[PDB]
Design a protein around this ligand. Structure first.
Ligand code: GLC
Ligand code: GLC
Ligand code: GLC
Ligand code: GLC
Ligand code: MG
Ligand code: MG
Ligand code: MG
Ligand code: MG
Ligand code: MG
Ligand code: MG
Ligand code: MG
Ligand code: MG
Ligand code: MG
Ligand code: MG
Ligand code: MG
Ligand code: MG
Lengths: 386, 386, 386, 386
């Protein structure tokens, strides 16, 4: 009954189940978790692996020998459980030095520090076997218009990512980068606020093949955008390197609800797309168990992430396999959308009088699209009524 | 006192002052304007030129000889007034045949018709001297998840724009294309919903140098995004071919208020950026005089568009020239944001102990950014209090 | 299998299935329906009744004898089908005379006309057996700040509703009024924009017992509000006289999708509340079949409204009856929320040292709320996984 | 030049300039301020007074003698500076015990504790001379649908406020209560989410005359609502007891920018209304100096709050006094909006054939409202261009 196993490739950040529940208006409601205990607990739930910021694993300001002890204990728990580390990232947002950003801070010495802190963790990520290195520029942005010249900031952002690409190529590392967009919070506006802006920026880097996106359900929904549409564009560009799964109820602060909560039908269409397109990367949950919960609620919330993915996968597969849905998809001309508009070429199109001079525009206009019947078949499948 | 002249390059769509006031809940409140009368009236107000959809100028279904008469009358009014036509576009959204889109309609024969209708108007636009051809795919999208496979739709969208680029290159035309994003309305979600998504899509076309964006103030604000930030990214990419200026009060239906209405401080920062970056294209107003107004209100609203641009241009120039603002910009390290992070290169950065091992993180963190004083100088300048 | 019958009390506006598909950017895609054919078709689908604006049933400007013929034909179709008319309303938004409002138009003569048009239709509604008369003030509002003094406008709004209440009391009619809030569209901001503002306004009318609310799913969601929470407050006040059911995908133009579309989990919690609280009024669908559809799609969309209500009713009933959910509700202390805080009274509370001086705040804080496990049981029930 | 003095009645919360800059993603960037130093600094800037939560002034868990020392030091600074304390409030949101609310927590013992903590601070507020006691129920709400039966929660909310009203009446205190709405954050949805919902709830309390609202600019804008419209409704009801002034850029997390930032034109229309209606309460700033700033930026931001109010007051007064604006207001029939619709009464309206049978609907419809010219005069005045 919807039991996950490590072959489902479900992963969690240490910072997710480890969130102590401090929000802008309240103190922590839960004690800190030891990273080793989170690995063991997630393994028992059926997770495939974990992800980390540098500062989740090694407390900021650790000596080189404290650092080695923290890594050794962690590696022992991975060895004991079979858990993998497919992704890692840098914390360039918590410490006060990053209050105006890391890569695009106005102060040049902070930008250099940010790059050195990042490079140190790329080495550790490669050592632990990560294939993707995520960058979330949560402090790159502004609350006011004159504080940040955005063209200069984009020059600095490109400079930073180009240097990171020079570093991993010169070291011979097999790792790729994924940029995680967010439109706002904690800055009033954040640079590269959506999947689209991030994809566009990547095409201006010196080695674009090293960079993709790590979209997050809730972040695109904080701009009111359709998250499965944005994922489709990332897959179309060949840039979906990683994904953050969670839930969000509309345009408000980043809630990071468990996956399946928030916009349930968008979750269904997302799973349909990921499974249809054959996405093979980790199914990563970036979520926060609500601060109302104790530790039993933390693990129930994490289990629910995986459960909802597996229920929606079953319902989406049943939808696509249903002969009546296949009939309805042809009724709505999804087959024709997949055929070229003008494989005969430009000149043939220009000479084709059935495309304009003799085209019966009123008869084409009268054809219903039959989209509502198709969508109710999708609803029946989602609700198990079919 | 803030009087426009044609050298300010203010342009208006025929459909703007010509909007009859029909909305989803009400009939028209104004009679139709003759395009010739709109040209003459806008010229008297100080406009530089006008723009048009094919169907604004030539009623849909006109014979080839009615077409010639409509164009001749129009050309005579341009000759009489000195007005230019810098941009033109196609109506692929009003007629019922386009109810599921033009370039990405599921029906293949509609897609071919859409391309033929577009090509016919590119010829006319070149004849009238337009330098930019805008595409707004207002019907390209969906209300439900199964109606539109977005990867196939993006294939069809790329196919259409590639064919248009083959057409203008084979004809030897000096015209470029600009894609106008909008996130929603009239479709539940529209493909290429923001500036970012459009910029990313352009980089996958066969001849990307022919395509840029035509962002609209209100459209990016319907997703809660920072419009001057998005314009900066378009300028950074070298893709700001055209712009639509108007006003919008937040996340709701597309209001198309006169420019300066809506988010006034965003309008100030937009003008600052366009003038600082030396944008030389048309300052185009895509706005709707509210349906409360009679024809005297139409021309007052149009005049207000230009007036507000010129007031904000004056205030932004005073801001940037003020020695006290120049001092504050250095106080906030805007000068340092413009300097390379690591012109010394990767290896020097790695060997620079002042970038990490000896970096005094607490002393850097203690430095205030002085952004609030800078922003209050900007407010004082905007309000004329300085 | 989820078949509606008239005892389920599903009703539809004539303007819903009759929407021709004209939106702000496009012409109609469907021909007009005769009201008689809509009654017959809805009866065959299992509807209980229909609702109407005056102008849906009697074309604007009809002679008194054309009026009588339109009503007679309509009454014959009701007699032939068994369909009821539980609600009626006035169109104070389509005609250009209402461009600045009806009850709160700045022009006094328009306000008087609006009241006379309303009163004429109250007589007809009573004749057809309606129990509720809805007012939706879609044009009452403003696009700019100086156009409307809102205190004077609220005086005029109160004046109008007080006169309508004087009219129905002096006539001896058994009808009540329901105010339908909407935050915006077609005006930039609409007066009484949410359920809350409407409830507050009612308490200042001379005969508040005659007035309640008619909330609409999509309208509260256009302000990002929780629609089941708002309905609970209306039920708490005893003011839920009628309800408009449909779907909406977040903060954007009013989509009026079929019920169950949009925010599916909010639809589940709404049905749970209406059924638990014993709401006995009509389940009215104010929805628009998308303009992509032909007439077969219109009736499929209408059928889907009813189907989704009945599926969600079944799932909500299964949730509330499940012993494991009953256990979880006590685990989360829903039983304690229903018990008085201080039935012992103020003085006893003040003297109760276990409420403050001896209250163990850390032990209370440590108690998990168990809300995530409860919510996953609700998800399992919704998806039929339980 | 726009210098505040204590007669302008500008007040600040201790928690505003005292915000250390901890947000959901980052540590504090500023040290804690001593309340005594904040009083002295605000007095030098021209403030009239300060406000406080119980826990801002007396650290949580203080002994009764530490409590007395904290109050004495505070009272000495008030005596030294002339500063007043017009409002006070309770912190029912920071401590983990309040994670599911105070007055509407599911656990009954937490609800009793919340009432005792509140009552203790009402006594102190009266001792310091406060006239208004604010309640902001920031934790009253839910992230999921089954966690909170909202009708039971409203019963508990009414119970709590009724007991507080019994307490202040039995003690003979001259203090009134003001409910501060917020739609979301830190709970997914908060009960009483807007001004309207709060006004409606007050009318169901046992002694409604003791309760009003304390609306906040940014909170109504987090629901996309028009804040001057909501204030007008509160003034119309006679319930504007207090106000929180700040700025917000649209629908996102609560930014609490300095007043004048965010939606500048809404700030202009708010000041116009408050000054026109003769609001005599405190002009209270609930704002957060951005965490980019050091302490010099804190005081610059606070000074800017007051400066922007005084600039906007001048511009609004110039607007209303301008004979050309007075002419335009009559042109737009604002004078007619203030006149009764039907002072002649219902029967006269029914007998008035010029209100319906002989009303020339097309001639009324043709009249322009002249709202755009009026709004451009308002823009010219705001920008000092007039
Ligand atoms: O970059 C990894 C993570 O960093 C921070 O935790 C962000 O809040 C989250 O969105 C992101 O995914
Ligand atoms: O494409 C030109 C114009 O077409 C339509 O009028 C759109 O509503 C507008 O946004 C666009 O700019
Ligand atoms: O008042 C009845 C109906 O009137 C209009 O059709 C509105 O768009 C709808 O929201 C409302 O319910
Ligand atoms: O209740 C007083 C204050 O409490 C908290 O600080 C809130 O964040 C603020 O909105 C409110 O005004
Ligand atoms: Mg996130
Ligand atoms: Mg998030
Ligand atoms: Mg994330
Ligand atoms: Mg537009
Ligand atoms: Mg627009
Ligand atoms: Mg446009
Ligand atoms: Mg509606
Ligand atoms: Mg609606
Ligand atoms: Mg409705
Ligand atoms: Mg606040
Ligand atoms: Mg706030
Ligand atoms: Mg506040």
């Amino acid at each position: 009954n919807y039991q996950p196993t490590p072959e489902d490739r479900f992963t969690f950040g240490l910072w997710t189940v480890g969130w102590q529940g401090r929000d802008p208006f309240g103190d922590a409601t839960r004690r800190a978790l030891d990273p080793v205990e989170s690995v063991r607990r997630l393994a028992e739930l059926g997770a495939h692996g974990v992800t980390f910021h540098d500062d989740d694993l090694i407390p900021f300001g650790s000596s080189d020998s404290e650092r080695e002890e923290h890594v050794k204990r962690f590696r022992q728990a991975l060895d004991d459980t079979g858990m993998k580390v497919p992704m890692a990232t840098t914390n360039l947002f918590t410490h006060p030095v990053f209050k105006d950003g890391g890569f695009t801070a106005n102060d040049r010495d902070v930008r250099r520090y940010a790059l050195r802190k990042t490079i140190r963790n790329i080495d550790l990520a490669v050592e632990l076997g990560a294939e993707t290195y995520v960058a979330w520029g949560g402090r790159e942005g502004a609350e006011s218009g004159g504080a940040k010249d955005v063209r200069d900031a984009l020059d600095r952002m490109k400079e930073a990512f180009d240097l990171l690409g020079e570093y991993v190529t010169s070291q011979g590392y097999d790792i790729r980068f994924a940029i995680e967009p967010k439109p706002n919070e904690p800055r009033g506006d954040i640079l590269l606020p959506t999947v689209g802006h991030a994809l566009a920026f990547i095409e201006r880097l010196e080695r674009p093949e090293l960079y993709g996106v790590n979209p997050e359900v809730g972040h695109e929904q904080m701009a009111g955008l359709n998250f499965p549409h944005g994922i489709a564009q990332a897959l179309w560009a060949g840039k979906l390197f990683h994904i953050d799964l969670n839930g969000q109820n509309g345009i408000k602060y980043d809630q990071d609800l468990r996956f399946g909560a928030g916009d349930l039908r968008a979750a269904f269409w997302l799973v349909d797309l990921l499974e249809s397109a054959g996405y093979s990367g980790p199914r990563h949950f970036d979520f926060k168990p609500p601060r109302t919960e104790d530790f039993d609620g933390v693990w129930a919330s994490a289990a629910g992430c995986m459960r909802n993915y597996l229920i929606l996968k079953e319902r989406a597969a049943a939808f696509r396999a249903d002969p009546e849905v296949q009939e309805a998809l042809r009724a709505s001309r999804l087959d024709e959308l997949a055929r070229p508009t003008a494989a005969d070429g430009l000149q043939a199109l220009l000479d084709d009088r059935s495309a304009f001079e003799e085209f019966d525009v009123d008869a084409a206009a009268a054809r219903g699209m039959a989209f509502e019947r198709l969508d109710q078949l999708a609803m029946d499948h989602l609700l198990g009524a079919r």
